[PDB]
C-alpha cells in the first residue's frame, strides 16, 4: 500500500542486537540494555500501524461515498 | 501513548565504563537508526489520529441525516 512506512529496525531486531564489548572507554551495558527494553515496548505498540492506516483509510473512503450518495 | 519520543532518544547519554562496556560508535550508530524510526512512528500515529477523528465525524454526519 502507498500509505505504508518502512522502518530500519523491528522490536525483535533491537531485542537480538549484540554490540561489540571493549576494555576501552565504552557505555555501561546495563544502562543501554534497559533503554532498549523501553524502545522495544514502543516498536511493539506501533508494529501494526501500516495495516491500521489502510483499514481507517478504506472505512474513510466508504463513509465519504455513502455521504455523497445522500447529497 | 509511547514511553519515549525521537527527542528523548536523540538526547540520551549513557554512563561510561572501562569494564567491558559497549563500543560507543556502534551504540550511537544504532540509536541514529532508532531516532529515524521514531520520526516515522510519530508521523504514522498522527495519521491514525487524523483518520480516526475523520471516521468518527463522518459516522456522526451519516447518523444525523438518517
Residue numbers in the entry:
A (entry chain B): 0 to 70
B (entry chain A): 5 to 70
Paper excerpt:
In the Firmicutes phylum, GpsB is a membrane associated protein that coordinates peptidoglycan synthesis with cell growth and division. GpsB is a DivIVA-like protein that is highly conserved in Firmicutes. The full-length Sa GpsB is a relatively small protein of 114 residues. Its N-terminal domain homodimerizes as a coiled-coil, while its smaller C-terminal domain homotrimerizes, forming a hexamer as the biological unit. Dimerization of the N-terminal domain is facilitated by a pattern of nonpolar residues every three to four residues, promoting the formation of a hydrophobic core in the coiled-coil. This N-terminal domain is partitioned into three regions: a relatively short α-helix with approximately two turns (residues 10–16), a second longer α-helix (residues 28–70) that forms a coiled-coil, and an amphipathic 10-residue loop (residues 17–27) that links these two helices and intertwines with the adjacent protomer, ‘capping’ GpsB.
Using X-ray crystallography, we solved the structure of the N-terminal domain (residues 1–70) of Sa GpsB at 1.95 Å resolution in the P21 space group, with four monomers per asymmetric unit forming two dimers (dimers A and B). The overall structure of GpsB is similar to previously determined GpsB orthologs and retains the same fold of DivIVA, though it shares much less sequence similarity. The most unique structural feature of Sa GpsB is a hinge forming at the midpoint of its N-terminal domain that causes each protomer to bend, adopting pitch angles (θ) of 137–140° (dimer A) and 156–166° (dimer B). In contrast, GpsB protomers from Lm, Bs, Sp, and Sa DivIVA are almost linear (θ=167–179°) and practically indistinguishable when superimposed. We find that there is a 3-amino acid insertion in the Sa GpsB sequence where the helicity is disrupted and that a cluster of four Met residues (Met45, Met48) are interlocked at the dimer interface at this position (dotted rectangle). These Met residues are only found in Staphylococci and take the place of an aromatic Tyr or Phe present in other orthologs, which normally stabilize the core via π stacking interactions. While the 3-amino acid insertion likely disrupts the continuity of the coiled-coil, methionine is one of the most flexible aliphatic amino acids and may further contribute to the conformational flexibility. Experiments using solution state NMR spectroscopy further support the notion of intrinsic conformational heterogeneity, suggesting it is a bona fide structural feature rather than a crystallization artifact. By extending the asymmetric unit, we found each GpsB dimer coordinates two others in a head-to-head arrangement. This involves the insertion of Arg and Lys residues from the membrane-binding loop into the PBP-binding site from the adjacent GpsB protomer, mimicking the binding mode observed between PBP mini-domains and GpsB in orthologous structures, such as Bs PBP1.
